[PDB]
A paper describes a structure:
Here, we show that Pseudomonas aeruginosa OprC is an outer membrane, TonB-dependent transporter that is conserved in many Proteobacteria and which mediates acquisition of both reduced and oxidised ionic copper via an unprecedented CxxxM-HxM metal binding site. As indicated by the successful structure solution, OprC contains a single bound copper and shows the typical fold of a TBDT, with a large 22-stranded β-barrel occluded by an N-terminal approximately 15 kDa plug domain that, like in other TBDTs, completely occludes the lumen of the barrel. The copper binding site comprises residues Cys143 and Met147 in the plug domain and His323 and Met325 in the barrel wall. The CxxxM-HxM configuration, which coordinates the copper in a tetrahedral manner, is highly unusual and has, to our knowledge, not been observed before in copper homeostasis proteins.
To obtain copper-free OprC after purification from rich media, we constructed a variant (OprCAA) in which the binding site residues Cys143 and Met147 were both mutated to alanines. Even after equilibration of OprCAA for 30 min with 3 or 10 equivalents Cu(II), no coelution with metal is observed, indicating that high-affinity copper binding is completely abolished and confirming that the His7 tag does not bind Cu(II) with an affinity high enough to survive SEC, possibly due to the presence of 0.5 mM EDTA in the SEC buffer. The binding site residues of both structures occupy very similar positions, indicating that the introduced mutations abolish copper binding without generating gross changes in the binding site. Superposition of the structures shows that for the remainder of the protein, structural changes upon copper binding are confined to the vicinity of the copper binding site, with parts far removed virtually unchanged (overall Cα RMSD approximately 1.0 Å). The largest change is observed for loop L11, which undergoes an inward-directed motion of approximately 8.0 Å upon copper binding (S3D, S3E). Some loop tips (e.g., L4, L5, L6) in OprCAA lack electron density for a limited number of residues, suggesting increased mobility. In the double mutant, copper becomes solvent accessible due to the absence of the Met147 side chain (S3D, S3E). The observed position of the Ton box in OprCAA, likely hard to reach from the periplasmic space, would prevent nonproductive interactions of TonB with transporters that do not have substrate bound.
Numbering used by the authors: 14 to 283, 285 to 392, 398 to 505, 507 to 671
The structure:
């Protein structure tokens, strides 16, 4: 029971990773969804500024990742993806994080081409009147503090629970002594009312809001509001019969209301946005899920349907140059531009054939649709697709086979999976051109259809615990973005065919009773088959080595992160956020941490991130901004040396 600081999370079982987001983590996260993925091999993070990075899994970006909060979806609204889904998610407020790698599940919605990421909160169940609380307080270099509170009280016929957080940090500095434009502020508060009329039933009401700020060194505008409101309803009846083992039903409402501007966290420079300017955009998502679990004999079957509708609006500021009067964005009416629908049916079937063999297969069928509400485009021109609808029905599915060896505690696995994903908001509305000879992006961007083989192994010995996961795949009609400066600067979305391949592996050895040593490796590769080029924004080879000493009451450990250069890039190509420009330099970062359990109710941890004050940037981080004094194409640098300490109470 020696307490530790997390520097990496293992594959505890084929393709799936499970972690507790309320334990301290070595390179210390913002209150950010993406930063809590940095400990899971396979993930990289596009740096935008201080917080709210854009997470990338085995080279893949964006909606190729299903990131659900409590089974529900939270979608932001900036055409920038300045408020990416994970900018609204504060992971210390949830109880469990779970990553399913590859297109190997169909329970959690459509388009899960790269992987599935589930943040969830667990129901409370008192057996009598009682009340537990969990809190944490953290403080660190450059004015970072994070405060989180999880309090609940109840009895056997119900409970009520409050979960909140407050977190911020000033601008950090790099390994060369410069202030990076990067400060941020975040808070959330969500309440849950839970009714438990017997030992099998649970109805839960949930409501919560949150807001935040964030200065972005990588952008021309900052996030001055990340307002979120959400509602939810859960139903869990258990053991309805000998065969129906669970029936779960849920509905969710998430509303995002974002503001980008160039005057509240910065000042307009000379550069093609010299005037004070702001843009307010919002996204209203409503959806539900309904699933029955059948368990009998050697079979488990999960059957269900789900649905989702979401709607996007925008409205912008207006600044008069003769009078220098600024009219804020909220003085103008809302302009709807997009509405999306998805309805889907799914099943997934597991066969427990003997104890050393399992075979899992799953299928789902989705009907996805979108309607363009833009009467005009922006000087305003008439929108050639104003009020057009497109739809499509996309089947997806997978089979996976897991076999355990007879002599050693080893599990081998191989799975083959197919994902079909209707296009994004950002892939359909944000690009200023479609494929060549096309009206718009909206009418010609084809859905992305990826087909991939997953394989790997698990091994759990007494002194050794190791895992490996490799993949090779093709992506048909990959949605790629191309950048050119010309009038001004503009993107074009196209559909290409892509080969991709890579993997991750990790191992932990227990040397002494007190010494542990772990390591992990992550490799991602991509090729644009249609132009005999490499795929853009692909993170380079990355290993992490770690040694820690435990002693019952406390623990100390060190960590080395080592990343190769990246030499395969596709210049002026990427996603809606970033573009490849230059090859990248390798680098190494070494860090220290420690943890001490003061008593059963209080724990202590601390660490030094980047001990040797390395000045370095990651291949995926955004470029500079010129307005912030950034050069030719300097990508935003990582933090330099940083100190932090955190106390955890639990009664």
């Amino acid at each position: 029971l020696a307490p530790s600081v997390v520097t990496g999370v293992a594959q505890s079982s084929p393709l799936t990773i499970v972690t507790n987001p309320k334990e301290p983590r070595q390179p210390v996260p913002a209150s950010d969804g993406a930063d809590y993925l940095k400990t899971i091999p396979g993930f990289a993070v596009i740096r935008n500024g201080g917080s709210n990075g854009d997470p990338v899994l085995r080279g893949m970006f964006g909606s190729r990742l299903n990131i659900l909060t409590n089974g529900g979806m939270m979608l932001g609204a900036a055409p920038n993806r300045a408020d990416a889904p994970t900018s609204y998610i504060s992971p210390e407020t949830y109880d469990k994080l779970t990553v399913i790698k590859g297109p190997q599940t169909v329970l959690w919605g459509p388009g899960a081409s790269a992987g599935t990421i589930l943040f969830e909160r667990e129901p409370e169940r008192f057996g009598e009147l009682g009340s537990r609380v969990n809190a944490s307080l953290l403080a660190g270099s450059n004015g970072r503090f994070d405060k989180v509170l999880d309090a609940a009280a109840g009895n056997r016929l119900g409970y009520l629970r409050f979960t909140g957080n407050h977190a911020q940090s000033d601008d950090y500095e790099d390994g060369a002594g410069n202030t990076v434009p990067s400060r941020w502020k975040k808070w959330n508060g969500d309440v849950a009312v839970g009714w438990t009329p017997d030992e099998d039933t649970l109805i839960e009401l949930t409501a919560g809001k949150g807001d935040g700020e964030a200065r972005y060194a990588g952008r021309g505008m900052d996030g001055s509001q990340f307002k979120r409101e959400s509602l939810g309803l859960r139903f869990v009846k258990s053991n309805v019969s000998d065969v129906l083992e669970k029936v779960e039903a849920q509905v969710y409402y998430n509303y995002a209301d974002h503001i980008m501007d160039n005057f509240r966290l910065r000042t307009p420079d000379p550069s093609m946005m010299p005037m004070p300017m702001a843009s307010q955009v919002d996204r209203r998502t409503l959806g539900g899920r309904l699933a029955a679990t059948w368990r009998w004999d050697d079979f488990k079957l999960v059957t269900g349907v789900d649905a989702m509708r979401n709607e996007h609006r925008a409205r912008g500021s207006k600044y008069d140059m003769m009078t220098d009067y600024y009219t804020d964005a909220d003085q103008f009416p809302w302009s709807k531009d997009a509405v999306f629908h998805n309805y889907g049916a799914f099943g997934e079937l597991t066969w427990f054939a003997a104890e050393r063999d399992r075979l899992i297969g799953g299928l789902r069928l989705d009907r996805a649709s979108v309607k363009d509400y833009r009467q005009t485009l922006k000087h305003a021109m008439a929108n050639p697709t104003a009020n057009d609808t497109r739809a499509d029905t996309l089947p997806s599915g997978f089979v996976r086979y897991e076999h355990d060896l007879a002599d050693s505690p080893t599990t081998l696995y191989a799975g083959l999976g197919h994902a079909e994903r209707f296009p994004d908001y950002w892939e359909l509305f944000s690009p200023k051109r479609g494929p060549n000879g096309s009206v718009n992006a909206f009418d010609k961007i084809k859905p992305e259809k990826t087909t991939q083989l997953d394989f790997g192994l698990q091994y759990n010995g007494d002194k050794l615990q190791a895992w490996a996961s490799g993949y090779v795949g093709v992506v048909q009609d990959f949605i790629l973005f191309s950048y050119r400066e010309g009038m001004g600067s503009s993107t074009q979305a196209t559909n290409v065919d892509a080969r991709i391949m890579g993997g991750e592996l990790g191992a932990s050895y227990q040397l002494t009773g007190n010494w542990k040593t772990d390591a992990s490796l992550a490799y991602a590769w991509g090729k644009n088959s249609s132009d005999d080029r490499a795929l853009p924004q692909i993170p380079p080879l990355e290993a992490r080595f770690g040694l820690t000493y435990e002693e019952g009451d406390w623990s100390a450990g060190s960590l080395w992160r080592v990343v190769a250069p990246q030499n395969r890039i596709a210049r002026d190509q990427g996603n809606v956020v970033g573009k490849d420009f230059d090859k990248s330099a390798g680098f190494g970062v070494f860090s220290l941490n420690g943890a001490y359990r003061v008593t059963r109710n209080v724990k202590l941890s601390a660490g030094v991130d980047n001990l040797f004050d390395k000045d370095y940037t990651e291949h995926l981080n955004k470029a500079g901004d010129a307005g912030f004094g950034f050069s030719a194409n300097e990508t935003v640098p990582e933090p330099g040396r940083t100190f932090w300490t955190k106390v955890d109470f639990s009664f």
